[PDB]
Structures are given as structure tokens and as C-alpha cells.
């Protein structure tokens, strides 16, 4: 300190941080990257709730992204942008409990609404340091304070021997909560308003966000929530205590390991070993199932997310939820026979029926037939293009769209201001094939305003659209309302209500209000399927 | 005496009556006996062929209507009464009516044999909507309709018994068919071109004939309007017929022989008095005495027969009306009435589904409910009402038809399907029932050509089109006009394309998929849901 840039020095509760002046298209932003918010969850601290980071001495360099939490690294399509863009971009380490803060540069005069991003990655992957989560644009363009944190994923985050001390489960959520606690404490040092914290997150991040909505100790830590393509309810975002126990003990078996003995043994297992084996504990051949996810421990989650959304009072909550046009497509290439990124993935009826089983792994034969019969276009039951798309839809609807519809409804029904969107714009830069439509996760780069970066080769329409979305997200963070309070000429985004079930199309075209989030089909999944499973 | 009105049939001479149809005379021979009156000991028995008679049998007026329940829900309401018996009720009713052109056809003219509906509990070939003169006059069709026994008299089965083997109303029909085969030539009818057509229970009956081998030699083409031998109401199992017959018999104070013998001692109205009361559940579109799967007339269930049948040289015209289900709702589904708009509650809808799909488990019913709810307007009465209509119409007609169509198409039949979407301007039922069950018949029969009936000009032209389809179909097995070029063409229904046409005032529109998604629910899913309780 002396010749350092004065705007980049900030003190948080744990000590002094030197951030970095990042170049955003419209000008500088302040980034404090790699701020530790927890004690490294290593050694005996593996599977343990995060312990808050102990203060450090001197100026913690916060100029680079810290380690990515240990995770399975997708090698399905090696060096393909569409996969690699989601892969860890820093070293894998269990010492990964860091968070990142972008703020305008200079730091906002007045306390600025804070956006906390919680990445997705199925609870087994992700990193706040991914290019698509770059907060610089929101910071620069929207003046937003954007916080993203690493949280433990995979076994490290979610292995649970529920009821135990040494592996209570949901610790990755606890990381997240800790990072939320951090923002509450420290964000004002960046000119973030701790009294205006909006969680947003996509997929597992969305699920994690929803789980903070649903978990009391989290509720005082944020004020608004965006759930993108993910919900805490649904068939993948959680597992029962029983099932978590089952998976944790199985994983233990797989790697060579009463609860203490078993965790202690897992704790001696090298990180990579856990990762190499985590996939191998899933109960069925499945897609959109992840081995180590939030567990309904009766603690973080006092009950199933279903029970909590169906009964919780969400009076004081503004939630923005939504989906991409093709939530299922992405998943199909990871295990549904017949699907590939490299061809049209036109499938047979057989491959559809088979895919339905994999995509709805919990489905009894009856349920699977129901699904199939529902998604078959009986006018062309054999049309492979339809079958391919129905397969996408099955997976998408079941895991995201219908969980989301359910969430939007349950929330709306119980006091939330809910805004619902479907995001229908295929990035011009998508490397996933056309058939995959707008896959799960490809709205993120737009919410984050990556298209503002002219080096990134988006169309100017996409630049404008990204700007629109950032406006929505940040208006929402600011006010609880995505609508521009000044730009009345623009079409309006009405809240989603149980009566009207209004949601907007997010595309290049101006906002189109649509009714009923895939209402017929979601009645199938949210109302009928349960009953079919339960008999 | 008018020589054109004198016909020697097998059993003797008949005097018909020259009737006036708007375009000129038709010879009508009404009330021709084709069976021994199925009276006394012959109650519940297969019809025996009518003994020859001396002299000239007066066939100038309709004979009695088979003994049947008379609908009295809306007394003196054109909408209900038009289906009520218009001749004396009698067990002695086994008579058929032939309309022919006047003068009678120079050459063997295709025959249309109409088999009325009435849920197998009612009907009469003598109803005004079955007036064959128009088809006779305009299309030069020889049209035949028979009374067949309904209700207990036609379908009270004690399966495996000698004295009530069941399906006798269908045998009555078969006998009328045989009669046509043996006699229609005398009227100018071509026994080598006999098209059965029927609507609803009639259509199911026609279906039965398709599905029953002895019947197969008595017709070449079939038209099933709003009814099918398959589906939830057209048939009962043997065990169920037995249970209902023995229930009825219990209800009227009655070993098969003795049970039937006692039933035979019972005034007709005593049987009809208790007819309704033997249905297993609070039903609509379910009838107590229907064709039974006896392993005889029906060697298996219609399902099995349509699934496995050979229909290579069969032509079948099948269709439905826009609102197959509305009509039935007024008859037991709470919240529904012809007088108010029948805007029902959700509760009333759930309750109506248990009544509309009486065979449904809770889960099955929930599945129906979840399927037919507009989740966008879930509590909307207009929607719930219309969905109720739809539930009933689809379960009972549309999806059975779609399935019949598909199984026949697949099994090598030539199939033309339609949906009839034009509401008679003269319909007395409320608008919300749209195009109810049976209100195409008047058009097919050409009643709008009767300018006294006050149909619109458009409807006269339309009835003309429909008579052309039906008789063209009768003539050729193809409802398309081999004279007309672009009309456009009514394509065969096939399992692949599932093409059917809208019969309405607009020209034919070819559509694909007869409620395909919904019928998959009904025909493919719902059964699995019962096949697992
Ligand atoms: O062979 N599987 C190995 C394994 C091991 C341990 C955990 C998970 N797996 C599979 C991954 C499945 C889901 C693949 C999803 C990859 N993905 C990454 C970023 C953004 C989206 C997606 C998928 N969207 O469908
Ligand atoms: O109240 N019912 C007493 C009863 C008694 C003994 C046998 C049957 N029932 C039910 C008859 C109702 C259904 C009336 C249907 C009227 N209908 C007549 C001709 C053609 C079509 C229809 C109705 N279509 O919905
Ligand atoms: C995008 O296009 C530019 C300019 O034509 C080119 O130099 C570059 O290789 C491309 N890079 C990306 C990020 O797509």
C-alpha cells in the first residue's frame, strides 16, 4: 500500500483485500476475486459445515479467481467449447471456499443492490470463476454489486450421513449460506447494500437459491431470489436422508470405507478418489440425477422442498423464476442412447421409451408409459424428430419446467411476487447443435451480459437483448420488479399468479406475455405423476 | 291398386304406400314382418323367421315400436320426444321398413339398412329422423330399417341358457339383414350391395355385425355413426349380463329356465320398470341390456375381435358428431340441464367424471380429470362443462370410434371417418350441447330436403351432400362423388395419416387425428391404469 490503486483496497471482516481493476466494455469495474469466506474445508473439515474464514494478516490478494471446488470434470466432448465452458477454470482443490465481488469502479457512492450468483452444475460441479459468471458487466453496466461464491459440490459439498456430526449434509449449501453471511457483513465495504441482496442461480444454483428461500437461517441473508432453470423441489434437487445415507455409505464402500469411522475413512480418501466414484452411486441409469445433492436433513431443509413450498408463507418474497426453451436437450447427450452433439439425434420409438426410463429414472413402468403416452405425438408416434424433441421435453419438463411451474405456483399461491419467464433465445454463438434449441444454462451469458463484450462475437441484437436482461435481473434485484420503472413504453412483465399464470418470453423480440407455464403437461408431472407413483 | 306398390316377398304379398318426398314419389313398404312376434315364450328368444301369410299384407304404416323405456325427462320437448316411440309399444315389433324409388329401381339398387340407436334400450325404425323417403327419392336408394328388440327384450341374456341366450336384438337385426338378402331384390334392392348404417347403439350394432361372422354375408359395407361395438357401453361380459339379468329377475320377483320362464310371465312394462335399476354404478352412457359377449354372436369381446379381425374387403364409414358427450350429461350428471347453460363447478366436474366414466378407479378418474382440466382455466365453468361433455363423448364414442377406425384400417378395412360439426338450425337442445349425439341423422336421412321442416337452404344443400356421401359410400364403398372432381376428396382413414373429414356446411376439410392425443389417453393409457387398478 502506497503505489496501489486506492479503489482496489477494501477491508472486510477477515482483513484487507486488494482487488483488481477489470476492463469491461463500458469501462473499469472493481473485482475482488478469491476472497476466502471460509476456513478451507480440508482434512478433518471435509464434509463439515464451513467454519467462517479466520482473519488474515496483511493484504489478501483478491485479483485472481481462487480454486474451484473439487469436482468431476466433464470430458464427454474434449475441448468442445459447449462443455469446456462449464469446466473448472482454476485448480481443483477442496480449499475452494472463496467468493468474488464485482462492483462499479470506482465503488458505488451509495449502497448498491447486491446480486449473489450461485452457480449450477448439478451440485457436483461449477465454479463462480467461469467465464459465463463474469460479474464485470452487471457491475459496469448495471452498477450492480455482484457476488459469487464457490461452494463445495459433489461429495465434498453434499455427502451426508444424515444425523451425524461429521457429515451432516448440505454443507455446500452451508458454504453458500456462509458466503451470504459474508455479504451481509462485508458487502457494504464494497458499497453493496446488505439490505438488498438478491440471490440468483441457475440449475443447481437456482435449486440452491430456492433452498435458501426454504431454509430459515438463510432467509435473513437475502431479500429476493432469482431461480433460473432450477428449483429446490423437483426430482433431482434433493434426496431423502435415507437415500443420502444410502449414497454416502455406498460411495464409502466404493472407495474402501458407525458414522464417524466411515467419514473418517472418507476423509482419508483423496479428493479425486471421491470424485472418480461419486457418479457410481446413482440408484438408476439416469440423466439429470446427481449423486450428492442437498439432503432433506430436517435441519437445513426442515422438510421436503415440496412440503416447504406447498405450506411455507412467502409473503415477503419476490422471486423471479424461469426456464430456457429447451431444458432437456443438454441432458440427453449425457447418457440417453441415440443422442449426440454431433448429429441430429433423431431417435426411434424404442430409444424414446428407453430414454424416458433414463430420464425419469424413478418412474415405474406405468409412470413411464404415462410419460411416453403423454409425450407421443399420436399423429406421428414414430417420427424421430418429434421423438427426439419429446425426449428433450420429457427431461426438461420433468426436471425443470414443471418443478419451476410448481414452484412459481406454490410461491404465488402463498404470497410471493413471482415473475416467470421462458428464455427462448439461442445464443448465436452456441456450439451445441441446433437441435438442442436453447439448452439449460445458455441464458446465463445473457443475464451476465457477456454479449456486451465485443470480442465475444455476439450479434448487436444479442448485445441489446443482454442489456435488456441485465436490466430485468437488476431491476428485480433493486426493486423486486424486473420491469423498468422508467421505460413504461416497453412491454410489461406481469407477475406470475396462480390465476393468470403469466410469464414472459425472453427473446430478441420485445417481451411477450404468455399464460400458463406448460400448464397441461405440468399438471401431468406435478399432479398426476405423483399419484401414479403412489399406487 | 298401384302395381308399383305390390311386392311379392318370400313370405307373401305386401302392399306398400306411395309416399311423397319433395322431389317426387317413393314407394314405402312399412311394417313388414320379418320375424314371428317375439312374444310369450319367444320373449328373449332368437327371432324365428316370419311365417308366410295369405293375401296382401298391408305394409303402408309403421308397425309397433319394440317395447322400451320411454324417455320422459323433458315431457313434450321436441329434443327428447323426437326419439320417443312414435308408434304403439309392443313386444310384437319385429318389422322392417323398405323405402324404394317410385317407380321401383330398373336395376339392382344399393341397399342401405339403417339400424337405429337408443342405447339398446330404445329406438324404432319409425322415427321421423329415420324417414327413408329422401334417400329413397333423391339418391334412388332402397332403404331398409328394422325394428329390433331393445332393453330386456333384446338383450336380457342368461349366457349359455337356451331360453335367453342374449343378443337377440342383434339377431333380430341379423334376421332383418337375411330378410333383405332374401327379399330386397323384389323391391329393386341389390342384395349384393348392402350397406348397414346405424348411429350410436345402431352403430355399435352395425359394428357387431361386422364382428359377427353369420352377419358378414348379409352386408358389404358399414357405417357406424357415433357408436362402435368396442368401447365401454356397447357390450357387457357374459358374467355381467348374467348378473344384470338375474338382478332384473330378482327386481321383478323371479336355474335359468325357471328364472327366464318367470321373466316371460312379466308384463313388458314390469321389465322396463326395472331395466335402469340393474346398472352397477351411477352412470350415464351406460345401458342395462346390451349385446353380451356370448362367445357366439360375438366370439370374443369387440376389443379382441377388432384387434384380430380380418377386414380386407370391408368398407367402413365411421364418424362422430362434434359434441358426442353433451346429450348424455342432462341425464344424470348433476349440474347439467337443457335449460340453463350448465356451467358446472369443479366439484361437479369431478363428480361428473365418476358418473361419466363409471368404470373408473379414483386414479383413473383423477387421470381423466387431470387430462380434461384446462389447467389454465381450471375452475372455469364453460371449460369444465365442455370438458365434461368431452370426457363423456370421447370415452364413449370418439375414442372407441378412433380405435375402431384404427383397428379396421390396420386390419385391412377401407375406412372413411368424419366428424360431423354442423348443429341443426332447428335443434331444440341448448347451444352448449353443440352438435349432440344423433343430430346428424336427420341430415344423412335428408330431412332438410323437406322444406316444411324449416332447415336453412345451406342445410338442404348439406343434407344433399351427406346423402351423397352415404349413398356413394353405399354404392361403391367410397363416399366420394366419382362424378365430382375437386370437392375436395374425402381420404380414407388410415392408421398412418388418420385422415378424416369435417362434415359441416363448409366444404369437406381433411383433418388428421381423431382426438389423437386424448384417445391415446383413453385407448392406450386408461386401460393400463385399470390393468393395474
Ligand atoms: O459419466 N458421468 C460422469 C459423472 C461423474 C460425476 C458426476 C456426474 N457425471 C456425469 C455428468 C452428468 C450431467 C452432465 C451435465 C454437464 N453440464 C455441464 C454444464 C452445464 C450443463 C451441463 C448439462 N446440461 O444438461
Ligand atoms: O332416467 N332413465 C331411465 C332409464 C330407464 C330404463 C333404461 C334407461 N334409462 C335411462 C335413459 C336415459 C338416456 C336417454 C338418452 C336419450 N336419447 C335418445 C335417443 C338418442 C340419443 C339419446 C341421448 N343421447 O345422449
Ligand atoms: C470472433 O471473430 C473475430 C473477428 O472476426 C475473430 O478474430 C475471432 O477469432 C473470433 N473469436 C471468438 C471469441 O469467437
PDB file of N, CA and C in Angstrom, chain B residues 241-310:
ATOM      1  N   UNK B 241     -73.807 -59.739 -17.943  1.00  0.00           N
ATOM      2  CA  UNK B 241     -75.163 -59.905 -18.453  1.00  0.00           C
ATOM      3  C   UNK B 241     -75.950 -60.787 -17.486  1.00  0.00           C
ATOM      4  N   UNK B 242     -75.354 -61.920 -17.127  1.00  0.00           N
ATOM      5  CA  UNK B 242     -75.960 -62.839 -16.179  1.00  0.00           C
ATOM      6  C   UNK B 242     -76.345 -62.115 -14.897  1.00  0.00           C
ATOM      7  N   UNK B 243     -75.423 -61.331 -14.354  1.00  0.00           N
ATOM      8  CA  UNK B 243     -75.677 -60.644 -13.098  1.00  0.00           C
ATOM      9  C   UNK B 243     -76.828 -59.661 -13.278  1.00  0.00           C
ATOM     10  N   UNK B 244     -76.801 -58.904 -14.354  1.00  0.00           N
ATOM     11  CA  UNK B 244     -77.868 -57.945 -14.574  1.00  0.00           C
ATOM     12  C   UNK B 244     -79.205 -58.626 -14.842  1.00  0.00           C
ATOM     13  N   UNK B 245     -79.182 -59.756 -15.540  1.00  0.00           N
ATOM     14  CA  UNK B 245     -80.405 -60.453 -15.857  1.00  0.00           C
ATOM     15  C   UNK B 245     -80.949 -61.017 -14.581  1.00  0.00           C
ATOM     16  N   UNK B 246     -80.089 -61.651 -13.788  1.00  0.00           N
ATOM     17  CA  UNK B 246     -80.570 -62.216 -12.549  1.00  0.00           C
ATOM     18  C   UNK B 246     -80.919 -61.131 -11.528  1.00  0.00           C
ATOM     19  N   UNK B 247     -80.360 -59.936 -11.699  1.00  0.00           N
ATOM     20  CA  UNK B 247     -80.740 -58.818 -10.835  1.00  0.00           C
ATOM     21  C   UNK B 247     -82.111 -58.345 -11.246  1.00  0.00           C
ATOM     22  N   UNK B 248     -82.287 -58.111 -12.540  1.00  0.00           N
ATOM     23  CA  UNK B 248     -83.584 -57.708 -13.021  1.00  0.00           C
ATOM     24  C   UNK B 248     -84.616 -58.709 -12.511  1.00  0.00           C
ATOM     25  N   UNK B 249     -84.368 -59.986 -12.778  1.00  0.00           N
ATOM     26  CA  UNK B 249     -85.284 -61.031 -12.400  1.00  0.00           C
ATOM     27  C   UNK B 249     -85.606 -60.974 -10.909  1.00  0.00           C
ATOM     28  N   UNK B 250     -84.606 -60.704 -10.081  1.00  0.00           N
ATOM     29  CA  UNK B 250     -84.833 -60.506  -8.647  1.00  0.00           C
ATOM     30  C   UNK B 250     -85.781 -59.316  -8.424  1.00  0.00           C
ATOM     31  N   UNK B 251     -85.500 -58.197  -9.086  1.00  0.00           N
ATOM     32  CA  UNK B 251     -86.326 -56.984  -9.004  1.00  0.00           C
ATOM     33  C   UNK B 251     -87.785 -57.179  -9.404  1.00  0.00           C
ATOM     34  N   UNK B 252     -88.049 -58.181 -10.228  1.00  0.00           N
ATOM     35  CA  UNK B 252     -89.415 -58.450 -10.668  1.00  0.00           C
ATOM     36  C   UNK B 252     -89.977 -59.766 -10.099  1.00  0.00           C
ATOM     37  N   UNK B 253     -89.330 -60.301  -9.067  1.00  0.00           N
ATOM     38  CA  UNK B 253     -89.835 -61.472  -8.361  1.00  0.00           C
ATOM     39  C   UNK B 253     -89.523 -62.849  -8.927  1.00  0.00           C
ATOM     40  N   UNK B 254     -88.467 -62.974  -9.715  1.00  0.00           N
ATOM     41  CA  UNK B 254     -88.159 -64.259 -10.331  1.00  0.00           C
ATOM     42  C   UNK B 254     -86.945 -64.953  -9.706  1.00  0.00           C
ATOM     43  N   UNK B 255     -81.475 -71.459 -11.439  1.00  0.00           N
ATOM     44  CA  UNK B 255     -81.861 -72.215 -12.624  1.00  0.00           C
ATOM     45  C   UNK B 255     -82.430 -71.293 -13.705  1.00  0.00           C
ATOM     46  N   UNK B 256     -81.727 -71.218 -14.833  1.00  0.00           N
ATOM     47  CA  UNK B 256     -82.068 -70.268 -15.885  1.00  0.00           C
ATOM     48  C   UNK B 256     -83.483 -70.419 -16.371  1.00  0.00           C
ATOM     49  N   UNK B 257     -83.864 -71.661 -16.673  1.00  0.00           N
ATOM     50  CA  UNK B 257     -85.159 -71.943 -17.274  1.00  0.00           C
ATOM     51  C   UNK B 257     -86.248 -71.269 -16.477  1.00  0.00           C
ATOM     52  N   UNK B 258     -86.246 -71.516 -15.175  1.00  0.00           N
ATOM     53  CA  UNK B 258     -87.309 -71.046 -14.305  1.00  0.00           C
ATOM     54  C   UNK B 258     -87.257 -69.537 -14.183  1.00  0.00           C
ATOM     55  N   UNK B 259     -86.048 -69.008 -14.073  1.00  0.00           N
ATOM     56  CA  UNK B 259     -85.864 -67.579 -13.991  1.00  0.00           C
ATOM     57  C   UNK B 259     -86.413 -66.905 -15.239  1.00  0.00           C
ATOM     58  N   UNK B 260     -86.007 -67.398 -16.398  1.00  0.00           N
ATOM     59  CA  UNK B 260     -86.491 -66.839 -17.637  1.00  0.00           C
ATOM     60  C   UNK B 260     -87.988 -67.080 -17.765  1.00  0.00           C
ATOM     61  N   UNK B 261     -88.436 -68.302 -17.471  1.00  0.00           N
ATOM     62  CA  UNK B 261     -89.849 -68.595 -17.598  1.00  0.00           C
ATOM     63  C   UNK B 261     -90.641 -67.591 -16.787  1.00  0.00           C
ATOM     64  N   UNK B 262     -90.158 -67.256 -15.598  1.00  0.00           N
ATOM     65  CA  UNK B 262     -90.866 -66.294 -14.767  1.00  0.00           C
ATOM     66  C   UNK B 262     -90.792 -64.899 -15.363  1.00  0.00           C
ATOM     67  N   UNK B 263     -89.612 -64.510 -15.832  1.00  0.00           N
ATOM     68  CA  UNK B 263     -89.485 -63.246 -16.519  1.00  0.00           C
ATOM     69  C   UNK B 263     -90.483 -63.164 -17.671  1.00  0.00           C
ATOM     70  N   UNK B 264     -90.625 -64.269 -18.402  1.00  0.00           N
ATOM     71  CA  UNK B 264     -91.563 -64.344 -19.512  1.00  0.00           C
ATOM     72  C   UNK B 264     -93.016 -64.126 -19.091  1.00  0.00           C
ATOM     73  N   UNK B 265     -93.310 -64.320 -17.811  1.00  0.00           N
ATOM     74  CA  UNK B 265     -94.666 -64.122 -17.298  1.00  0.00           C
ATOM     75  C   UNK B 265     -94.900 -62.662 -16.986  1.00  0.00           C
ATOM     76  N   UNK B 266     -93.897 -61.835 -17.204  1.00  0.00           N
ATOM     77  CA  UNK B 266     -93.976 -60.489 -16.702  1.00  0.00           C
ATOM     78  C   UNK B 266     -94.423 -59.491 -17.757  1.00  0.00           C
ATOM     79  N   UNK B 267     -95.477 -58.722 -17.461  1.00  0.00           N
ATOM     80  CA  UNK B 267     -95.832 -57.615 -18.331  1.00  0.00           C
ATOM     81  C   UNK B 267     -94.586 -56.869 -18.819  1.00  0.00           C
ATOM     82  N   UNK B 268     -94.554 -56.531 -20.099  1.00  0.00           N
ATOM     83  CA  UNK B 268     -93.463 -55.759 -20.634  1.00  0.00           C
ATOM     84  C   UNK B 268     -93.074 -54.578 -19.746  1.00  0.00           C
ATOM     85  N   UNK B 269     -94.029 -53.761 -19.323  1.00  0.00           N
ATOM     86  CA  UNK B 269     -93.642 -52.593 -18.536  1.00  0.00           C
ATOM     87  C   UNK B 269     -92.967 -52.940 -17.218  1.00  0.00           C
ATOM     88  N   UNK B 270     -93.241 -54.118 -16.649  1.00  0.00           N
ATOM     89  CA  UNK B 270     -92.593 -54.520 -15.383  1.00  0.00           C
ATOM     90  C   UNK B 270     -91.091 -54.683 -15.601  1.00  0.00           C
ATOM     91  N   UNK B 271     -90.709 -55.195 -16.770  1.00  0.00           N
ATOM     92  CA  UNK B 271     -89.304 -55.350 -17.133  1.00  0.00           C
ATOM     93  C   UNK B 271     -88.642 -53.988 -17.296  1.00  0.00           C
ATOM     94  N   UNK B 272     -89.230 -53.161 -18.140  1.00  0.00           N
ATOM     95  CA  UNK B 272     -88.767 -51.804 -18.355  1.00  0.00           C
ATOM     96  C   UNK B 272     -88.796 -50.977 -17.060  1.00  0.00           C
ATOM     97  N   UNK B 273     -89.750 -51.265 -16.187  1.00  0.00           N
ATOM     98  CA  UNK B 273     -89.813 -50.612 -14.873  1.00  0.00           C
ATOM     99  C   UNK B 273     -88.502 -50.712 -14.119  1.00  0.00           C
ATOM    100  N   UNK B 274     -87.829 -51.844 -14.288  1.00  0.00           N
ATOM    101  CA  UNK B 274     -86.653 -52.157 -13.508  1.00  0.00           C
ATOM    102  C   UNK B 274     -85.393 -52.221 -14.349  1.00  0.00           C
ATOM    103  N   UNK B 275     -85.550 -51.984 -15.639  1.00  0.00           N
ATOM    104  CA  UNK B 275     -84.443 -52.009 -16.601  1.00  0.00           C
ATOM    105  C   UNK B 275     -83.236 -51.234 -16.076  1.00  0.00           C
ATOM    106  N   UNK B 276     -83.471 -49.946 -15.832  1.00  0.00           N
ATOM    107  CA  UNK B 276     -82.479 -48.955 -15.425  1.00  0.00           C
ATOM    108  C   UNK B 276     -81.736 -49.383 -14.155  1.00  0.00           C
ATOM    109  N   UNK B 277     -82.472 -50.023 -13.257  1.00  0.00           N
ATOM    110  CA  UNK B 277     -82.033 -50.266 -11.892  1.00  0.00           C
ATOM    111  C   UNK B 277     -80.938 -51.318 -11.728  1.00  0.00           C
ATOM    112  N   UNK B 278     -80.577 -52.013 -12.804  1.00  0.00           N
ATOM    113  CA  UNK B 278     -79.536 -53.051 -12.724  1.00  0.00           C
ATOM    114  C   UNK B 278     -78.111 -52.614 -13.098  1.00  0.00           C
ATOM    115  N   UNK B 279     -77.910 -51.356 -13.497  1.00  0.00           N
ATOM    116  CA  UNK B 279     -76.559 -50.850 -13.797  1.00  0.00           C
ATOM    117  C   UNK B 279     -75.703 -50.801 -12.521  1.00  0.00           C
ATOM    118  N   UNK B 280     -74.428 -51.254 -12.619  1.00  0.00           N
ATOM    119  CA  UNK B 280     -73.569 -51.415 -11.428  1.00  0.00           C
ATOM    120  C   UNK B 280     -73.271 -50.098 -10.694  1.00  0.00           C
ATOM    121  N   UNK B 281     -73.181 -49.005 -11.451  1.00  0.00           N
ATOM    122  CA  UNK B 281     -72.835 -47.687 -10.909  1.00  0.00           C
ATOM    123  C   UNK B 281     -73.768 -46.569 -11.403  1.00  0.00           C
ATOM    124  N   UNK B 282     -73.723 -45.438 -10.685  1.00  0.00           N
ATOM    125  CA  UNK B 282     -74.378 -44.190 -11.085  1.00  0.00           C
ATOM    126  C   UNK B 282     -73.770 -43.807 -12.427  1.00  0.00           C
ATOM    127  N   UNK B 283     -74.512 -44.103 -13.484  1.00  0.00           N
ATOM    128  CA  UNK B 283     -73.999 -43.992 -14.834  1.00  0.00           C
ATOM    129  C   UNK B 283     -74.716 -42.945 -15.665  1.00  0.00           C
ATOM    130  N   UNK B 284     -73.983 -42.480 -16.673  1.00  0.00           N
ATOM    131  CA  UNK B 284     -74.566 -42.008 -17.912  1.00  0.00           C
ATOM    132  C   UNK B 284     -73.840 -42.762 -19.007  1.00  0.00           C
ATOM    133  N   UNK B 285     -74.519 -42.900 -20.143  1.00  0.00           N
ATOM    134  CA  UNK B 285     -73.992 -43.562 -21.323  1.00  0.00           C
ATOM    135  C   UNK B 285     -73.605 -44.986 -20.972  1.00  0.00           C
ATOM    136  N   UNK B 286     -74.446 -45.601 -20.162  1.00  0.00           N
ATOM    137  CA  UNK B 286     -74.321 -46.995 -19.875  1.00  0.00           C
ATOM    138  C   UNK B 286     -75.732 -47.546 -19.830  1.00  0.00           C
ATOM    139  N   UNK B 287     -75.907 -48.733 -20.391  1.00  0.00           N
ATOM    140  CA  UNK B 287     -77.238 -49.268 -20.584  1.00  0.00           C
ATOM    141  C   UNK B 287     -77.299 -50.660 -20.044  1.00  0.00           C
ATOM    142  N   UNK B 288     -78.433 -50.999 -19.467  1.00  0.00           N
ATOM    143  CA  UNK B 288     -78.505 -52.207 -18.677  1.00  0.00           C
ATOM    144  C   UNK B 288     -78.450 -53.455 -19.545  1.00  0.00           C
ATOM    145  N   UNK B 289     -79.095 -53.398 -20.699  1.00  0.00           N
ATOM    146  CA  UNK B 289     -79.203 -54.587 -21.504  1.00  0.00           C
ATOM    147  C   UNK B 289     -78.721 -54.315 -22.878  1.00  0.00           C
ATOM    148  N   UNK B 290     -77.487 -54.747 -23.117  1.00  0.00           N
ATOM    149  CA  UNK B 290     -76.779 -54.504 -24.349  1.00  0.00           C
ATOM    150  C   UNK B 290     -76.233 -55.821 -24.893  1.00  0.00           C
ATOM    151  N   UNK B 291     -75.699 -55.831 -26.121  1.00  0.00           N
ATOM    152  CA  UNK B 291     -75.143 -57.058 -26.628  1.00  0.00           C
ATOM    153  C   UNK B 291     -74.179 -57.585 -25.614  1.00  0.00           C
ATOM    154  N   UNK B 292     -74.226 -58.892 -25.375  1.00  0.00           N
ATOM    155  CA  UNK B 292     -73.322 -59.537 -24.456  1.00  0.00           C
ATOM    156  C   UNK B 292     -72.280 -60.296 -25.248  1.00  0.00           C
ATOM    157  N   UNK B 293     -71.069 -60.359 -24.713  1.00  0.00           N
ATOM    158  CA  UNK B 293     -70.033 -61.151 -25.302  1.00  0.00           C
ATOM    159  C   UNK B 293     -70.363 -62.562 -24.874  1.00  0.00           C
ATOM    160  N   UNK B 294     -71.016 -63.279 -25.779  1.00  0.00           N
ATOM    161  CA  UNK B 294     -71.527 -64.627 -25.515  1.00  0.00           C
ATOM    162  C   UNK B 294     -70.635 -65.740 -26.034  1.00  0.00           C
ATOM    163  N   UNK B 295     -69.565 -65.371 -26.726  1.00  0.00           N
ATOM    164  CA  UNK B 295     -68.729 -66.338 -27.424  1.00  0.00           C
ATOM    165  C   UNK B 295     -69.485 -67.006 -28.566  1.00  0.00           C
ATOM    166  N   UNK B 296     -70.544 -66.361 -29.029  1.00  0.00           N
ATOM    167  CA  UNK B 296     -71.368 -66.917 -30.091  1.00  0.00           C
ATOM    168  C   UNK B 296     -71.579 -65.814 -31.125  1.00  0.00           C
ATOM    169  N   UNK B 297     -72.554 -64.940 -30.899  1.00  0.00           N
ATOM    170  CA  UNK B 297     -72.728 -63.846 -31.809  1.00  0.00           C
ATOM    171  C   UNK B 297     -71.428 -63.075 -31.805  1.00  0.00           C
ATOM    172  N   UNK B 298     -70.857 -62.906 -30.625  1.00  0.00           N
ATOM    173  CA  UNK B 298     -69.575 -62.271 -30.504  1.00  0.00           C
ATOM    174  C   UNK B 298     -68.651 -63.320 -29.944  1.00  0.00           C
ATOM    175  N   UNK B 299     -67.813 -63.884 -30.805  1.00  0.00           N
ATOM    176  CA  UNK B 299     -66.932 -64.966 -30.407  1.00  0.00           C
ATOM    177  C   UNK B 299     -65.933 -64.513 -29.344  1.00  0.00           C
ATOM    178  N   UNK B 300     -65.689 -63.208 -29.272  1.00  0.00           N
ATOM    179  CA  UNK B 300     -64.897 -62.627 -28.203  1.00  0.00           C
ATOM    180  C   UNK B 300     -65.391 -61.225 -27.920  1.00  0.00           C
ATOM    181  N   UNK B 301     -64.668 -60.473 -27.099  1.00  0.00           N
ATOM    182  CA  UNK B 301     -65.025 -59.073 -26.861  1.00  0.00           C
ATOM    183  C   UNK B 301     -64.811 -58.334 -28.149  1.00  0.00           C
ATOM    184  N   UNK B 302     -65.608 -57.299 -28.391  1.00  0.00           N
ATOM    185  CA  UNK B 302     -65.275 -56.444 -29.519  1.00  0.00           C
ATOM    186  C   UNK B 302     -63.813 -56.035 -29.578  1.00  0.00           C
ATOM    187  N   UNK B 303     -63.183 -55.757 -28.429  1.00  0.00           N
ATOM    188  CA  UNK B 303     -61.763 -55.398 -28.409  1.00  0.00           C
ATOM    189  C   UNK B 303     -61.014 -56.463 -29.143  1.00  0.00           C
ATOM    190  N   UNK B 304     -61.176 -57.698 -28.690  1.00  0.00           N
ATOM    191  CA  UNK B 304     -60.418 -58.800 -29.243  1.00  0.00           C
ATOM    192  C   UNK B 304     -60.731 -58.949 -30.723  1.00  0.00           C
ATOM    193  N   UNK B 305     -62.006 -58.851 -31.070  1.00  0.00           N
ATOM    194  CA  UNK B 305     -62.402 -59.036 -32.441  1.00  0.00           C
ATOM    195  C   UNK B 305     -61.866 -57.951 -33.366  1.00  0.00           C
ATOM    196  N   UNK B 306     -61.849 -56.703 -32.917  1.00  0.00           N
ATOM    197  CA  UNK B 306     -61.316 -55.655 -33.787  1.00  0.00           C
ATOM    198  C   UNK B 306     -59.793 -55.723 -33.868  1.00  0.00           C
ATOM    199  N   UNK B 307     -59.170 -56.140 -32.772  1.00  0.00           N
ATOM    200  CA  UNK B 307     -57.722 -56.271 -32.732  1.00  0.00           C
ATOM    201  C   UNK B 307     -57.227 -57.339 -33.696  1.00  0.00           C
ATOM    202  N   UNK B 308     -57.988 -58.424 -33.816  1.00  0.00           N
ATOM    203  CA  UNK B 308     -57.546 -59.610 -34.542  1.00  0.00           C
ATOM    204  C   UNK B 308     -58.325 -59.874 -35.829  1.00  0.00           C
ATOM    205  N   UNK B 309     -59.359 -59.081 -36.092  1.00  0.00           N
ATOM    206  CA  UNK B 309     -60.250 -59.359 -37.210  1.00  0.00           C
ATOM    207  C   UNK B 309     -59.578 -59.222 -38.565  1.00  0.00           C
ATOM    208  N   UNK B 310     -60.172 -59.848 -39.582  1.00  0.00           N
ATOM    209  CA  UNK B 310     -59.759 -59.638 -40.965  1.00  0.00           C
ATOM    210  C   UNK B 310     -60.829 -58.843 -41.671  1.00  0.00           C
TER     211      UNK B 310
END
